[PDB]
Design a protein around this ligand. Structure first.
Ligand SMILES: Nc1nc2c(ncn2[C@@H]2O[C@@H]3COP(=O)(O)O[C@@H]4[C@H](O)[C@@H](COP(=O)(O)O[C@H]3[C@H]2O)O[C@H]4n2cnc3c(N)ncnc32)c(=O)[nH]1
Lengths: 178, 178
């Protein structure tokens, strides 16, 4: 099942990142000018927990990550679905009670597929293989984005293992660099 | 890359079908009672062209398939995205100028990933392998749905090869049976 994470990464690129990354800066600029608090950063920040533990509510993983607003939606006809909607959420990052950064932030959803596959007996995906597939997912995606025309300093991958751990501090480190 | 279609099918189930199938009949019943034309059929009809040719506009594949309306959207928090939106389109099927059926209808989007992967040199997916992966995708999905609790006569797969061909007649055949 090595080809499992491989295909999921290509799917994530083909069916999502390549479609939304080109329009992202315009959506952010629209938000910055129309519905606004400091400036939203210019990159999509993608969280890649190698334990494939992907909560649906980000504030649950860390209270210092607080939902601010939704980006204006992106829509288009997709595979027979009229006006399919692509949604992204903006988060504020707090640090000792100060707003320290603002960004479009989400988990890489395919890591949730890896996790659920490892739970379903019919998937033939060993629970022991979650970390290995997660790593391959990250490496594949990294190699894809390194060479993708739509990636132009508008995407940032954040991969990490928890062994304390501060997810907000991990994100702020990448924001600081930018 | 056999594991390619395998993973895509499990992804399609885990990240989509298992989430939307349980609520689908209530969304259809809501539409039937609130925004209505004959009754919308009770199953989600999924188109699986084995040539992986997936137009984004269904009326383009066959003019006898005409967009009627959107189902009421489904939303939930998903992997850090607040109120992620799941959308489905309702279509009327015409037959010699008569409205002959009405259903929720779409292409299986992962077939688009197979297709695009076969085009990208970095994916290492042979163009010659599209039909084989498409078949495996269909077989895997079929085996998944055969045993899935959320599938309860509310999903129908329509797989086909074009060698004339009438996509509308192919769909109407399955609707007739139901
Ligand atoms: N009609 C309809 N179908 C939907 C919708 N959302 C998902 N589907 C179907 O489920 C497959 C898996 O979805 P996922 O959210 O678990 O992750 C996908 C996948 O890893 C990768 C490629 O997507 P696609 O090829 O369209 O496969 C999707 C589809 O067949 O990108 C991820 N992804 C796709 N859309 C989003 C999004 N809006 N936000 C975050 N991640 C996404 C739906 O709304 N309607």
């Amino acid at each position: 099942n090595f080809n499992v994470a491989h295909g999921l990464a290509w799917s994530y690129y083909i069916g999502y990142l390549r479609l939304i990354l080109p329009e992202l800066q315009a959506r952010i600029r629209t938000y910055n000018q129309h519905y606004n608090r400091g400036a939203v950063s210019q990159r999509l920040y993608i969280l890649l927990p190698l334990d494939c533990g992907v909560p649906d509510n980000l504030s649950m993983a860390d209270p210092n990550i607080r939902f601010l607003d939704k980006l204006p939606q992106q829509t288009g006809d997709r595979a027979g679905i009229k006006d399919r909607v692509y949604s992204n959420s903006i988060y504020e990052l707090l640090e000792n009670g100060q707003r320290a950064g603002t960004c479009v932030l989400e988990y890489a959803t395919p890591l949730q597929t890896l996790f659920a596959m490892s739970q379903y007996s019919q998937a033939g995906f060993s629970r022991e293989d979650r970390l290995e597939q997660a790593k391959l997912f990250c490496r594949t995606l990294e190699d894809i984005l390194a060479d993708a025309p739509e990636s132009q300093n508008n995407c940032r991958l954040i991969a990490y293992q928890e062994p304390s751990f501060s997810l907000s501090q991990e994100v702020l480190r990448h924001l600081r660099q930018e």
